[PDB]
């Protein structure tokens, strides 16, 4: 039914602003919400059917120390949506304590749109991991969000914060955010700033406006993830229907992203399926092997050859996916979305459960381990001491991330009929 989206932090507000602009550009609408004359499709998934034939997006704005919010304010995309949801540190503990005192008024902002909506389906979170203002605040609000409504779903769009060296408190912040990301979130789509920066320096020669182009990438991914919902499809026209197949085990919910063209500034089915399969078109970067893959295709595609394509990708036999109960790489096929001009027609997006993210988790765990052992980089503040005097929240997150690495590695084993 109806999904309410959330954005917090300056990076999260940037990606949400770009997402709403990019769906305004996709749909046959004006930047005021007025429908165009050439419209149809389903436009109730994130757009409130507002009072002047406006499709107002339902977006929760959360900001602290507003810098980008003024730039969002003086724009012709503030006439598209304005639900009056604006409500005013760089540490996780500081953001946690600042979210502590004002939770009731932003919760009134939540309940306003909750009662304004007739139905509710899920909550999408635009949150920047170790983002300074976003960190701590987003973790606290995530905790209160899943506490209040256990009848809904949570997706969180996350980045892996490390530019490979800078800030020494960031592994603590991302670790505490990762603890809540495990136990208070039901689906996590993780992105790599390193992998996106490498692909941006690959296809182009830009490395300085990286945020602006990464906005374009994430908005395309978020729109392609929702095209079967926003346009009349048949399967996973709800969020939960999409989330259900991918997760065999309720803590194995980390979702890998790839995309079949790399440069965006006739081919057949099994071709782009095979290219989406490769890890070098995967834009997020002992054995590591996939649990289950789901893929969506959108473009000009001849539909009758897909079964022979399915056979050819089968006998090509590219991944030795899993040993215990039988998953698959699973296809979904969609139409290329109308109501806008379309270049680079054949475009695919893949959602996969892979244990290879345990390597990145062990990377930031090793960074935390060396910074904890050296003990000159905790940056002891009264915020962190008053939040936790013995700093055993780090210990709880540490044993939980150990359990998750154990879960990954024992799932990679042929025996996960015993738990571990």
């Amino acid at each position: 039914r109806e999904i309410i989206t959330l954005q917090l932090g300056q990076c999260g507000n940037q990606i949400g602003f770009e997402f709403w602009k990019q769906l305004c550009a996709e749909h046959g609408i004006s930047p005021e919400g007025i429908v165009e004359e050439f419209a149809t499709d389903r436009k109730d998934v994130f757009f409130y059917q507002a009072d002047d034939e406006h499709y107002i997006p339902r977006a929760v704005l959360l900001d602290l120390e507003p810098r980008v919010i003024h730039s969002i304010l003086n724009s012709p995309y503030a006439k598209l949506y304005n639900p009056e949801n604006i409500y005013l540190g760089n540490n996780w503990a500081s953001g946690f304590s600042q979210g502590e005192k004002i939770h009731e008024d932003i919760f009134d902002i939540i309940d306003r749109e909750a009662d304004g909506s007739d139905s509710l389906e899920g909550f999408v979170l635009c949150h920047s991991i170790a983002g300074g203002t976003g960190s701590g605040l987003g973790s606290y609000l995530l905790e209160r969000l899943n506490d209040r409504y256990p009848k809904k779903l949570v997706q969180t769009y996350s980045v892996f914060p490390n530019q490979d060296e800078d800030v020494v408190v960031q592994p603590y912040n991302s670790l505490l955010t990762l603890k809540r990301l495990t136990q208070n979130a039901d689906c996590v789509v993780v992105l790599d700033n390193t992998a996106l920066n490498r692909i941006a320096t690959d296809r182009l020669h830009i490395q300085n406006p990286s945020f602006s182009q990464i906005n374009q990438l994430v908005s395309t991914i978020m729109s392609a993830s929702t095209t079967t919902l926003r346009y009349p499809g048949y399967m996973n026209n709800d969020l939960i229907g999409l989330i259900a197949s991918l997760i065999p085990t309720p803590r194995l919910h980390f979702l890998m992203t790839g995309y079949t063209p790399l440069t965006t500034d006739k081919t057949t089915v099994l071709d782009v399926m095979r290219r989406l399969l490769q890890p070098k078109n995967v834009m997020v970067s002992t054995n590591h092997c996939y649990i289950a893959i789901l893929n969506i295709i959108q473009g000009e595609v001849d539909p009758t050859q897909v079964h022979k394509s399915l056979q050819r990708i089968r006998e090509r036999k590219l991944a030795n996916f899993i040993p215990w109960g039988p998953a698959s790489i699973q296809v979904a096929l969609s139409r290329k979305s109308p109501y806008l001009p379309s270049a680079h027609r054949v475009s695919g997006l893949m959602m996969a459960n892979h244990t290879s993210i345990s390597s990145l988790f062990e990377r930031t765990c090793r960074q935390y381990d060396k910074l904890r052992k050296r003990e000159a980089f905790l940056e002891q503040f009264r915020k962190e001491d008053m939040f936790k005097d013995n700093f055993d929240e780090m210990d709880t997150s540490r044993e939980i991330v150990q359990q998750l690495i154990d879960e990954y590695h024992a799932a990679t084993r042929p025996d996960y009929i015993s738990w571990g």
Binding site: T40, R42, P150, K151, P232, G233, Y234, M235, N237, D238, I240, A244, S245, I247, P248, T249, P250, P303, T304, V306, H307, L310, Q311, R314, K317, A319, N320, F321, I322, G325, P326, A327, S328, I329, Q330, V331, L333, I417, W419
Partner: protein, 264 residues
Amino acid sequence: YEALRHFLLMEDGEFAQSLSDLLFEKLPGELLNPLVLNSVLSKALQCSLHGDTPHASNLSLALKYLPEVPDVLSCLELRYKVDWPLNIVITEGCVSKYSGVFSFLLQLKLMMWALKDVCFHLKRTAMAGSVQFRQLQLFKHEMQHFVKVIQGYIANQILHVTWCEFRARLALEEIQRAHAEYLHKAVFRGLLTEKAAPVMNVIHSIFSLVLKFRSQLHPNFALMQQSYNTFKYYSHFLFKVVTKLVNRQPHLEDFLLRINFNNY
């Protein structure tokens, strides 16, 4: 054609996902009277924006059997009505077979309901991270996956390949023959044939076990685990039975790659 495909074969979502979702909230003779049965269609059409078309009318809803109720039986009739000069092309023996394939598609959505039920019942006790919890839930995902691959197979055959050869199949008698071939390929790729009847017979055993799995929520761990073991045995047995009947059909060859993919 491009109206009835979205009602009886339900290609457009949030019509099925509303009509079946509305009916399953209730659970009988106070459910089969035409004040609740005649009203759910009119409410399901509004949340797909199918309504206010000249194809939103001529729809007549009914049911062909009354239950007094494990049960895998679901019963519904939807018809489309065409007048005198269109009665000569679409026949009313053709429409009866459309209702017949409609019930076949409807029985699959009961699984899509029951799996969400058992996923929902576990949600309030999901707090715990117990041994009895995780190993139980792995069963639920694995039963969900079987439906998600077989429904993808139906969602391939009965709508993409058989409709692509209906957008050039049509060309006066040739129109009647082309529509009669459309239904023919749908019932051929639908495994209603007597040759692939035992392949359909195992599907009942899968369906009934998931419905019995739904009723137990924690009650006791072993009773559902036994059903999971029998389910695994049945799926492994189906893979051999469908293999023999391709080794001895062209659309069924796709089912072999669907049910076994990087496993055995």
